[PDB]
């Protein structure tokens, strides 16, 4: 099993860990901030997914410094993760294209 597939697998596991830790820590950052909506675990988890995929729905977002710090890590993990799957598919196609010219 090639590096690029191990890495994509790793990045998926690591992103799901980031989405759960992020759920938990967003609620922990945002409770105590009057007006905050990112304060129960289930919608925190939905929030973490729409943040990682950079969907920017705009139904939920953090209003505190530590919530926003948590948000930044989730976004970076999401963009890296999905970038790494792209790199992995590039490698696969470059390989399949070497072979298809008998290199």
């Amino acid at each position, epitope marked *: 099993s090639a590096l690029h597939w191990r890495a994509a697998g790793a990045a998926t596991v690591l992103l799901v860990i980031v989405l759960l830790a992020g759920s938990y820590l967003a609620v922990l950052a945002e*409770r105590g901030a009057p*007006g905050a909506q990112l*304060i129960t*675990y289930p919608r925190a988890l939905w929030w973490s997914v729409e943040t990682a995929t950079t969907v920017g729905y705009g139904d939920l977002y953090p209003v505190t410094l530590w919530g926003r710090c948590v948000a930044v890590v989730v976004m970076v993990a999401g963009i890296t993760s999905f970038g790494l799957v792209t790199a992995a598919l590039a490698t696969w196609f470059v390989g399949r294209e070497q072979e298809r010219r008998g290199h």
Partner: antibody
Amino acid sequence: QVQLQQPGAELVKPGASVKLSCKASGYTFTSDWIHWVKQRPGHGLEWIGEIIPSYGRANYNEKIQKKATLTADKSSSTAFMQLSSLTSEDSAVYYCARERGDGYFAVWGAGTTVTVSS
Amino acid sequence: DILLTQSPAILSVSPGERVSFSCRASQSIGTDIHWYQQRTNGSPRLLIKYASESISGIPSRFSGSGSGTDFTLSINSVESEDIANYYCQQSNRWPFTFGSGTKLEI
């Protein structure tokens, strides 16, 4: 089972403080928040504050004079509320309740009647 | 902070009749409203969560409806054991807040 056990009563001299206890049983999660709610006789429910025992962070009602300090003992599954410098304004039933981090008080203690009097 | 208005304070009904308790939020809170029953000398008891969801242990007689700002807890065919104060509570925005309460009177 009784999920939340509170002492029936505390008498407190005016000016003095008191620690209320709240010993939890049944399922405990990392996610669990313990809340405290004040009810004066013939009056409604007043949210005082919350603590997350797994991390020990606490938040308080801004809109009222801060009387309370919340702590928890991870090992003995007990949450504490230190009410300090009481007056007759502070005479009330104090409920503890458990929230699974999903927004609603699944279960309440039976409440501690706190009387401030000489 | 979200204000929950429960008007009227007292609701009189005859036995076996249907009754509706109102809860109005000062801004939209979707379906993040939960309802408690508190009998004389008793602690609160969760009846309905997220505006409409059953709790096991609660008579089918109880139901909830509403979204946004206007929420209703209903009892089809009231009976004596329903005599209590009924409170609403929001979990949309920090901090959680309670309605001032409505007494049912038969």
